[PDB]
Subunit: 248 residues, 4 copies
Amino acid sequence: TDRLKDKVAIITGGVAGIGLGIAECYVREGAKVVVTANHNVDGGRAAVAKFGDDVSLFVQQDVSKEADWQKVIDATIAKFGRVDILVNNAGIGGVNTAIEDLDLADWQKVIDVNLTANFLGEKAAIKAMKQTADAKGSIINVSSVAGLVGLPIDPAYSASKGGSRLLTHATALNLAQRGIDIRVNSVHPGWIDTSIVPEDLRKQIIATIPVGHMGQPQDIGEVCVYLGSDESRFANGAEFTVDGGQRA
Amino acid sequence: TDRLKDKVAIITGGVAGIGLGIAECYVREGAKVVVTANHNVDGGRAAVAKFGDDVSLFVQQDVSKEADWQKVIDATIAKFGRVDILVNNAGIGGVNTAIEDLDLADWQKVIDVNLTANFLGEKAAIKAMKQTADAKGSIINVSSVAGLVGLPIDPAYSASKGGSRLLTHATALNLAQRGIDIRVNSVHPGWIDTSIVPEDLRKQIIATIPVGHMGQPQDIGEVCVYLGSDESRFANGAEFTVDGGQRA
Amino acid sequence: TDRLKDKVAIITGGVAGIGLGIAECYVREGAKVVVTANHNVDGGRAAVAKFGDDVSLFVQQDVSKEADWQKVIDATIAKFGRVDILVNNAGIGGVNTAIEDLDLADWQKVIDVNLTANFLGEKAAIKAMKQTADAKGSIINVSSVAGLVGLPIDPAYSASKGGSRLLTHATALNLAQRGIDIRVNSVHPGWIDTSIVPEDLRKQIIATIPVGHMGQPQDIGEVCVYLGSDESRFANGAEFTVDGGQRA
Amino acid sequence: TDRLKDKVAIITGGVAGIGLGIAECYVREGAKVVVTANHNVDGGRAAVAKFGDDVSLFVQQDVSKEADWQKVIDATIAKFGRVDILVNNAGIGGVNTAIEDLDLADWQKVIDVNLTANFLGEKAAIKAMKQTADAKGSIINVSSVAGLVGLPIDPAYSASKGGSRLLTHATALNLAQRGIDIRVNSVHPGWIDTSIVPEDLRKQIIATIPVGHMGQPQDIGEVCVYLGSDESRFANGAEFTVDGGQRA
């Protein structure tokens, strides 16, 4: 009955909030998980303690670093022998500062983590899937509907989001044309309740949500199980939004 | 399992092809189904036979007719006592004809069946869910990515599809704003291998499919299980495409 | 030199607000105009007085009526000898009532006026262009970004808008595939300051506009001059939004 | 005529092909142009020779380099005293190679030139417009509908394209929110017949174009004249596609 039986998944930013929600759903459905985080060893160790070290592994990872991708792939294969699913969930939020005041370094850091990182991950995953999973698998690029509560005014955040969306389409088709059965899809969470916020802000947030409340981390986990499993074999290069109607 | 335990679903055009695949998945997951068809009595009887009459019911229905909607609602409540899910799947395909040669009656028939029918269905389903299911439910509007092999040149078919897409958004928001927990989403199948695919066009159809092959009815059934179940409680007014990369 | 020199245009809903501003720009650029309205003879006469009866003509027209389209075509050809441009601008607004409370007759009226009317006009213009303009011309379907101030919750209004958008694509492609050089594009005004904007809502409306103010009828006129003229010969099946950032 | 009377415009990649087409239309409408190019001194000198030293200037520019932007702004201000319009037209095309074979350096090259360059341009333009044009101006981001003949399989090309589109929206809104009258819009050319179009590839290319022929450089120029001028004062954060129906 386990919908992800025998699957091995890598989930970046997988030790807290949304990513932890995905990992929880994956473990529930019988998947072995490798959860990564750049600077959250405590969260990492706690997740493995929660899941059990027989079905989970924590690896420190900066997703913008090509070398950390090879590190994570190697650790996943040593521990679990294969790679079936990659969830690119790690990311940086938006800021409300003026575009003409944006330092190139701050633009570049966002592109590095929210866009280029997704490419680096897809490429690493694809190679590992050809090597260990008979050239089959599933890749999921997660990017929120909004990074800011107001108008989407953050140039770097928005650019990285639009970039990742089209990256998803192009990657799927690039593989598809060559008969490689590795699917690439994107998932777009609305506002998910992962921490406390000042009540003025929270009201603003919930005001942007037609159903009048935030979602939960496992709401994202559920659509990720669908996309990770063989149930969605014909879903490819597509976008899956779970946002309480936020962009309806 | 039983991801749809005790749910009662109405599936239009549910006795052949995509609709039947949806029905199969729903029954697999514990749903009670009412499958309908305009001109397929034998198919309806045969589907009930394989599902069993304790968990399925066949009702003859022309989805373009308001009176037939009340007929199905009435029969559904008589048999199963409630309505939890409506899958608007029934509809007609596109044609090659010149725009300026199109008769109003022929335009109108397509609008009636492929667009107006979905409004009538949503309205009938909402009333039934308010009356019998504590004003909670899930409505799924199914609309193919493509109605024709080549360029989407059919004005009535395209209009109806674009129409149904925005209907889904507006209906979900209309309900959400009044705090009614009835979610409305759309599903968009690519080319699915069924008897209604024109034989002479099969090889040409496949050449438009990036993954190089048609999908199966149960591929659409799986995403419909997700959207019918409470697993998708935060998915609303959104579009779920299962198409082998066709519109990627 | 006049950018619409020798061109003959029909503009529906052309004697008030947006339609009148389109007419004003067209006349300024040397076009001859046939402006129509369903119930506004005084406005029609006043527009002709302003423009001059040598370059303009008023015809009463209900755009939802097939017979009225033939009437307008006949009168245009009788007065000006040809038809080069059709601007489908006439239409009705949205309401904020519950989807499940909507009468079919009320749904149907909006689809008749805001969707089917556009098909009728396209068909009438195409035959006229083939007959009198060497099978060349430009058709413009105008549908605003928003019909209501708040969330787009009107199902009939939204469906007709989504419907008219894809109608534009399909018609453009239907013609192009047969080598017919009649272009079909859509124009999408944001909030324009005219007498038909509800007084009570003017302040709430302006809040939804990123640039902080409404536009002017001639703002829509300018983009329509571009689309009606030979300047946009390669612009086809496309969407031109002039909305002060409304849907950005 | 002079629809761009007294306006000063910077056009990157403006000495051949599409860029040159924009430059020609701009000069026709009374604009003064600064055309740039990374490695085409000949093309640059030919353009200035054609236009005349009094209304045109050529400056060498690598759009990926922050320092070259400061150089081009300084040169424009020394020559013409102000900056009114920026057309980000410079760009790299796509390749048909496999995503998992793509080197980070080659990915990064495309992001640098086709995405980050647009940001650097916007930023420099905005500063110059606040400084010299009373905080009013128009910025146009140009990106082709397709880089490749076949499926859009280039991950870097597509990502930068999707990124540039969203950058346009966010940048427009970032400015608009602060009451800054600098509009940002994008333009999307289909296949345009320029010197870099080789044989028989022509057949495949034209086969993707519903109107059955490539467009001309001035087709892109004409819509850019609309966006650069005061005729489009309410067009903001929007996408203007001129592609003969290619993505319809």
